[PDB]
Amino acid sequence: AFDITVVIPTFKAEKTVGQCLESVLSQQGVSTEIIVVDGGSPDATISIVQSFSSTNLTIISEPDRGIYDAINKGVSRAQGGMIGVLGADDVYKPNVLSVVKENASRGVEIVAGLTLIDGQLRADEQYRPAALISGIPFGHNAMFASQEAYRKVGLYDLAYRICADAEWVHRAIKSDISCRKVEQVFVEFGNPEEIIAEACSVIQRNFPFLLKEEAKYLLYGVRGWGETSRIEQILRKYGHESVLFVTALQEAFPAVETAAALEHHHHH
Ligand SMILES: C[C@@H]1O[C@H](OP(=O)(O)OP(=O)(O)OC[C@H]2O[C@@H](n3cnc4c(=O)[nH]c(N)nc43)[C@H](O)[C@@H]2O)[C@@H](O)[C@H](O)[C@@H]1O
């Protein structure tokens, strides 16, 4: 019934929710449903959300198990053709929703754009198997996914409080969900061991034969935070387990092509 659904999880968002909503309601060229999933804010959040045009805006306000629980409730109710998720500290840039509608017109399942963070572009990676030894390849708040993409992939895994976004996109890649990356900014905004722990866990969900430290090595290698002289060793160790894994490494690290060809030849 709507081109776009925007799911906005909120808790105590009074300082910025107005700006968030203004970036959504101002979007021209589309019909947009907004679902605000509030976790029981005691501040001005609900009143401010109510200060906007309510025609296509639903407010859920009730306790939840966190951001991704709230997102799941919103996604589950969404009626739009493409579904985006915006945090209250985020803004969509002008004309972004019309750009999503235009770029979704041939039936791609995910349309993702660029993200501006503290005035710099997020260092995005390609949506491909190489992302499976990394994190989320684009900003989650720059992502729009269709009803069918959510039906096929499913919901966000609440076990991940930091990286459920990455884990969902990794599932999309593994499920061969189609994706179109648009080279335009869609969204603007401004404990490391826990983040690293979750990111390594997400990678092991793709490749369960990896030790945590090997998942970490691969993540740091693809992101450029660490060295790569052990990639070939990792490839020899596990290549036989999974053609997807061999593919992921040869994409991430094209210099290991001669060794990856050898894994393919012997095992796949
Ligand atoms: C929206 C998500 O934000 C993540 O940023 P991440 O710093 O964790 O989370 P924050 O930026 O602090 O909060 C994100 C949004 O969720 C709301 N919020 C925070 N906690 C809760 C909660 O317990 N329940 C509900 N209903 N709302 C909550 C907050 O008001 C804000 O709009 C991204 O990493 C994800 O990719 C996605 O963009």
Side-chain angles (χ1 to χ4, degrees):
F2 302 102
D3 296 318
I4 308 286
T5 299
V6 182
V7 174
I8 304 169
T10 58
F11 185 68
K12 286 181 132 127
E14 74 183 354
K15 276 184 172 189
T16 58
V17 70
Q19 160 185 105
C20 176
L21 287 167
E22 252 156 18
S23 87
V24 177
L25 286 302
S26 59
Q27 294 287 325
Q28 315 186 63
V30 288
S31 58
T32 304
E33 170 182 54
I34 301 182
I35 303 179
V36 172
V37 187
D38 184 80
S41 301
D43 70 348
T45 297
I46 292 318
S47 179
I48 288 156
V49 169
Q50 280 171 350
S51 86
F52 288 84
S53 181
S54 51
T55 311
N56 301 319
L57 198 155
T58 289
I59 300 164
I60 297 171
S61 189
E62 65 185 15
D64 57 50
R65 296 169 297 180
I67 293 162
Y68 287 102
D69 195 26
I71 294 167
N72 286 340
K73 298 184 192 178
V75 164
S76 306
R77 300 246 265 144
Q79 301 182 267
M82 298 297 281
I83 302 161
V85 178
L86 202 63
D89 213 355
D90 301 335
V91 295
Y92 285 136
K93 308 305 300 174
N95 307 320
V96 163
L97 292 190
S98 64
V99 169
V100 171
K101 173 173 153 203
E102 278 154 30
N103 276 277
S105 86
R106 301 195 67 86
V108 74
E109 291 170 317
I110 294 174
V111 175
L114 304 168
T115 302
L116 192 70
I117 306 179
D118 297 317
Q120 298 173 62
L121 290 173
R122 191 186 180 285
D124 289 349
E125 298 158 61
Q126 302 177 57
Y127 179 100
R128 59 177 178 165
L132 300 173
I133 54 160
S134 198
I136 194 177
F138 40 70
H140 187 244
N141 49 9
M143 187 189 76
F144 293 78
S146 67
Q147 300 257 324
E148 276 292 286
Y150 273 110
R151 183 191 65 68
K152 296 202 276 191
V153 178
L155 293 175
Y156 292 94
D157 184 336
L158 301 190
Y160 291 106
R161 303 223 282 210
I162 302 163
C163 296
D165 53 354
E167 198 267 346
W168 188 98
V169 176
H170 290 194
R171 281 152 59 201
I173 291 168
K174 290 183 288 188
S175 297
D176 205 14
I177 300 301
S178 56
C179 177
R180 181 185 292 197
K181 181 68 183 295
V182 178
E183 296 290 327
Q184 287 179 248
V185 180
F186 282 6
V187 304
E188 177 180 346
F189 62 94
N191 179 341
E193 290 146 39
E194 313 192 326
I195 308 186
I196 294 317
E198 286 206 11
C200 290
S201 180
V202 166
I203 290 164
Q204 296 175 296
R205 228 157 138 74
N206 299 322
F207 304 118
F209 45 82
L210 298 171
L211 295 160
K212 286 203 186 302
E213 184 277 339
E214 295 165 328
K216 192 186 170 172
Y217 191 88
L218 293 169
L219 169 69
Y220 277 43
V222 307
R223 293 258 156 121
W225 306 330
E227 67 112 17
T228 50
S229 62
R230 297 175 35 206
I231 294 300
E232 252 187 72
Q233 279 167 46
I234 295 174
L235 180 56
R236 294 199 297 277
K237 184 179 184 184
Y238 296 122
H240 66 90
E241 296 279 359
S242 163
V243 66
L244 186 56
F245 183 74
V246 178
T247 298
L249 273 56
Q250 76 187 125
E251 288 180 350
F253 307 107
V256 304
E257 177 58 28
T258 63
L262 202 64
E263 295 300 317
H264 286 296
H265 178 261
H266 297 328
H267 309 301
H268 313 295

